[PDB]
Structures are given as structure tokens and as C-alpha cells.
Design an enzyme around this catalytic site. Sequence first.
Site, PDB file in Angstrom:
ATOM      1  N   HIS A 223       0.821  -1.206   0.000  1.00  0.00           N
ATOM      2  CA  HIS A 223       0.000   0.000   0.000  1.00  0.00           C
ATOM      3  C   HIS A 223       0.866   1.272   0.000  1.00  0.00           C
ATOM      4  O   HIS A 223       0.674   2.175  -0.833  1.00  0.00           O
ATOM      5  CB  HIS A 223      -0.971  -0.025   1.200  1.00  0.00           C
ATOM      6  CG  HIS A 223      -1.826   1.194   1.323  1.00  0.00           C
ATOM      7  ND1 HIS A 223      -3.185   1.187   1.077  1.00  0.00           N
ATOM      8  CD2 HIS A 223      -1.518   2.465   1.670  1.00  0.00           C
ATOM      9  CE1 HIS A 223      -3.670   2.405   1.252  1.00  0.00           C
ATOM     10  NE2 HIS A 223      -2.678   3.202   1.598  1.00  0.00           N
ATOM     11  N   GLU A 224       1.824   1.355   0.924  1.00  0.00           N
ATOM     12  CA  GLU A 224       2.665   2.555   0.989  1.00  0.00           C
ATOM     13  C   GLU A 224       3.568   2.660  -0.258  1.00  0.00           C
ATOM     14  O   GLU A 224       3.847   3.775  -0.711  1.00  0.00           O
ATOM     15  CB  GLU A 224       3.491   2.575   2.267  1.00  0.00           C
ATOM     16  CG  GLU A 224       2.614   2.618   3.544  1.00  0.00           C
ATOM     17  CD  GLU A 224       1.645   3.787   3.536  1.00  0.00           C
ATOM     18  OE1 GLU A 224       0.550   3.620   4.066  1.00  0.00           O
ATOM     19  OE2 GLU A 224       1.970   4.871   3.004  1.00  0.00           O
ATOM     20  N   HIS A 227       1.619   4.347  -3.046  1.00  0.00           N
ATOM     21  CA  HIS A 227       1.668   5.807  -2.896  1.00  0.00           C
ATOM     22  C   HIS A 227       3.010   6.321  -3.411  1.00  0.00           C
ATOM     23  O   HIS A 227       3.071   7.389  -3.998  1.00  0.00           O
ATOM     24  CB  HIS A 227       1.571   6.237  -1.446  1.00  0.00           C
ATOM     25  CG  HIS A 227       0.210   6.121  -0.835  1.00  0.00           C
ATOM     26  ND1 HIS A 227      -0.896   6.750  -1.364  1.00  0.00           N
ATOM     27  CD2 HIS A 227      -0.200   5.544   0.322  1.00  0.00           C
ATOM     28  CE1 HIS A 227      -1.936   6.540  -0.572  1.00  0.00           C
ATOM     29  NE2 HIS A 227      -1.541   5.811   0.457  1.00  0.00           N
ATOM     30  N   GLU A 250      -6.354   7.821  -1.231  1.00  0.00           N
ATOM     31  CA  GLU A 250      -6.431   6.588  -0.451  1.00  0.00           C
ATOM     32  C   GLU A 250      -7.342   5.579  -1.144  1.00  0.00           C
ATOM     33  O   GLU A 250      -7.004   4.415  -1.217  1.00  0.00           O
ATOM     34  CB  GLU A 250      -6.912   6.809   0.976  1.00  0.00           C
ATOM     35  CG  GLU A 250      -5.981   7.623   1.898  1.00  0.00           C
ATOM     36  CD  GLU A 250      -4.625   6.997   2.114  1.00  0.00           C
ATOM     37  OE1 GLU A 250      -4.410   5.807   1.802  1.00  0.00           O
ATOM     38  OE2 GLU A 250      -3.741   7.678   2.639  1.00  0.00           O
TER      39      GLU A 250
HETATM   40  O1  LIG Z   1      -3.458   4.710   4.492  1.00  0.00           O
HETATM   41  C1  LIG Z   1      -2.508   4.705   5.259  1.00  0.00           C
HETATM   42  C2  LIG Z   1      -2.650   4.130   6.614  1.00  0.00           C
HETATM   43  C3  LIG Z   1      -3.774   3.469   6.935  1.00  0.00           C
HETATM   44  C4  LIG Z   1      -4.021   2.829   8.259  1.00  0.00           C
HETATM   45  C5  LIG Z   1      -3.083   2.825   9.302  1.00  0.00           C
HETATM   46  C6  LIG Z   1      -3.390   2.202  10.519  1.00  0.00           C
HETATM   47  C7  LIG Z   1      -4.625   1.588  10.715  1.00  0.00           C
HETATM   48 CL1  LIG Z   1      -4.949   0.932  12.038  1.00  0.00          CL
HETATM   49  C8  LIG Z   1      -5.552   1.588   9.671  1.00  0.00           C
HETATM   50  C9  LIG Z   1      -5.257   2.206   8.455  1.00  0.00           C
HETATM   51  N1  LIG Z   1      -1.317   5.148   4.864  1.00  0.00           N
HETATM   52  O2  LIG Z   1      -1.112   5.529   3.542  1.00  0.00           O
HETATM   53 ZN   LIG Z   2      -2.622   5.162   2.127  1.00  0.00          ZN
END
Ligand SMILES: O=C(/C=C/c1ccc(Cl)cc1)NO
Ligand SMILES: [Zn+2]
Length: 407
Positions: A223-224, A227, A250
Site C-alpha cells: 500500500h505505501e 503511494h 487513499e
Molecule cells: O493509508 C494509510 C494508513 C492506513 C491505516 C493505518 C493504521 C490503521 Cl490501524 C488503519 C489504516 N497510509 O497511507
Molecule cells: Zn494510504
Amino acid sequence: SSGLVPRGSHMQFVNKQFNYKDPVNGVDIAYIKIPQMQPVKAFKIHNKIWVIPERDTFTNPEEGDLNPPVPVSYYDSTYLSTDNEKDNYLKGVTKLFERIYSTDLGRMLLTSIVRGIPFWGGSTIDTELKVIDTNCINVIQPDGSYRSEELNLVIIGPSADIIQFECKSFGHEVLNLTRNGYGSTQYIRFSPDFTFGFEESLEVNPLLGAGKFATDPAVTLAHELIHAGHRLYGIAINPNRVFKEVSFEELRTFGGHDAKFIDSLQENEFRLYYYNKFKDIASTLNKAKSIVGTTASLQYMKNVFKEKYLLSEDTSGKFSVDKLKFDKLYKMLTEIYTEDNFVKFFKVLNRKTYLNFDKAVFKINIVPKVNYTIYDGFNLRNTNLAANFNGQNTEINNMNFTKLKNF
Ligand SMILES: O=C(/C=C/c1ccc(Cl)cc1)NO
Ligand SMILES: [Zn+2]
């Protein structure tokens, strides 16, 4: 024991099996400074990618300390303070890179990241190519001397809030580097030592009800990384674009049905916006007459960016954006590289929409092969954990998840 090389002789993405205690060498283990900080020991896991096993007290001046000051957060000022923890962090991140790279999707994504060099748009002179200084680190040599090194990505430990994972970067005084096609060096605050929960109901006993599952940290890291891909190619969506709360950026990164809430007309507007930004880069390269701060030729650097942006070059040497190649690159970064698609490739359980997580936080350790593998994550084949995502079930695989409080 760690299981870093399940197939073949050596890891396929990460260049060395590092130990935190390995001596600095100035090449792939070094003290570095991010351009007042003390140097920090860092490891170069791949071309253009470094890992810093430290809490991030560096990238934001108003985030200097690790003490507690919105739905779910977790604090522990002592986390990642000892060499053993830093060693395990480095091995965890290494393992997660190899897990991501074990998938066709991860090879595509990581390749795109490595090729996505931030643009040399740093000159005040309109015809001069120049590096932007905040897209580099200073790499100290064993004898104390140092050199500036360009890079694309840094993985660093979290700041005060341990489960606040994010992809951040240094801004420019005038340029919007993550939204003008240029791109900028990305810093991902991430820990492989914790994860968060979500509830899911699986069908079959009728008396089962909802289970309490843990997110696979390879999905979180991917996910990161997604981004980072958007931001390295300078096509991030302005974070002021939100539903309310969840940002378009997101929803795009989560993918699946979440991304379908961004209407097609909005998508078209963004795509055209970024097509135009890429044409501006092509004309900047065409107008360039000189280069500074490198022994590399102007021709050579122009080519580096032709390669990044998939630019067409005519016989005269003039660059231009090809609409089909732009569409391909843009779709890859925004539609193909998504959290949903990684879930499909890993064949793990994940929450079904961006906001549907629990306030639950867990301490984990993915480094031991008996706990977590490159191919299966927690859902180890030929065990009770392979079925019904039992490996991710925090009540069934209780030894692998310690429930935390709850700040
Ligand atoms: O979207 C995120 C983080 C999302 C996220 C972090 C921690 C918890 Cl608990 C849920 C979602 N970073 O880009
Ligand atoms: Zn994110």
C-alpha cells in the site's frame, strides 16, 4: 530459520542479507544524513532504495520526540531503540520486500519505483538541468568523507505514533513535486513489528459469527509502495480531494470497488492534467542547454528521463509524450498497482473497504520462518493455518499476535 530464500540460491530483490552489526563500508552500509541531525546507520537494499532502522525523528521538525501528546494510535517511546530490534526490523523489511517481489505484481511495482528517478528540475535557470537537493542523501564513508547520492525511496521506522504508516517527502518552495510529474524521494514510515485488526465473517459451523483477523504487513507495505509510485512519477491526487473522511488518493491506492467511487469524469480530468504536466517535462528537456553538478553529459541525463517517462524521441532528438505510452504508464501506476490486487495475488484476507478496520493493534514477529513465510505469510501451507485464513485469525493463531492497548 528466517526463510529469506525459499527458492534459488539468493534473494531476488534485496542485494544482501544484512545484519545490523555489519560494519559501515560506504557502499551499501553507511552512516547517512538526510538533507541538524546525528548520522544514522542505513542499509542499501537495492539500487535507489535505502532502509533506516530508526524511529523517524528526522523528516518533520515538529515531530522530534516519541512521547504521546485519531481512531486508533499506539505509543511506545522505547520501540526500536536497541540494536537487536533494529536488526529484526531490517530482516523484517527485507523479508517483506522479497514477499512483494515474489508476485508478478510486485516485480512490476518495484521496477517502476526503481526507474522513477525524481526529475532534475532544481535550477532557477530555465535552460539548465540541476538536481533537487532534497532528493538526495549524504553517504558517509568509513574514513569520514562523504558523497551526495540520489535515491528514490527510504524505509524508516515510525515517529511517535507507531501504527501511523505513511509515505511522505520533502517539499519545494515553489514546485509541487508529487503533483507536477517531477517526483521526489519518498520516505515510508513503516514497522514490520506491528499490525492492525479487522473483523470479517466467513461462511460455512453456523455458530461461527465474525472473526478477528490481522492485516498482513506485506499488504500494508505494498500500500505505501503504491503511494510511493504515484509520488515518484508526480501524479499524486491533491490530498484536499476527499469524501467526508477518506481522500481520493487513499481510495485509488486501496483500489477494488473503493476506487470506483472516484467518478470517471473526475478521473479523466486528472489524467489530462498529468498528461499536460508530462508534456511540460518533455519541453523542459527539449529547451535544456546545460547541466550542472555531474560529470554526466546533458545527453545522458535527458535520456535517463526519456526512459523514466517513456518519452518518444524523433530523429532531431526532440522529445514528446506518446499518448498510448502515457496511458499505459498512468494506468499501471493508478489502476493496476492497488492494495486490492496485491490481496488477490497474495491470496490473503483483507478488509473489504478502506475505512473498515478495528481499533485493534498487535505486536508481531514475521522474521522467524515458523511464524511467517515469503510465499504464505501467516497462512502456512500443510498446517492448520492454511485453511480459512486461520494464520491471520488472532484467536486461532494467538501465539503470533499479542493484543496491545489502545491509546
Ligand atoms: O493509508 C494509510 C494508513 C492506513 C491505516 C493505518 C493504521 C490503521 Cl490501524 C488503519 C489504516 N497510509 O497511507
Ligand atoms: Zn494510504
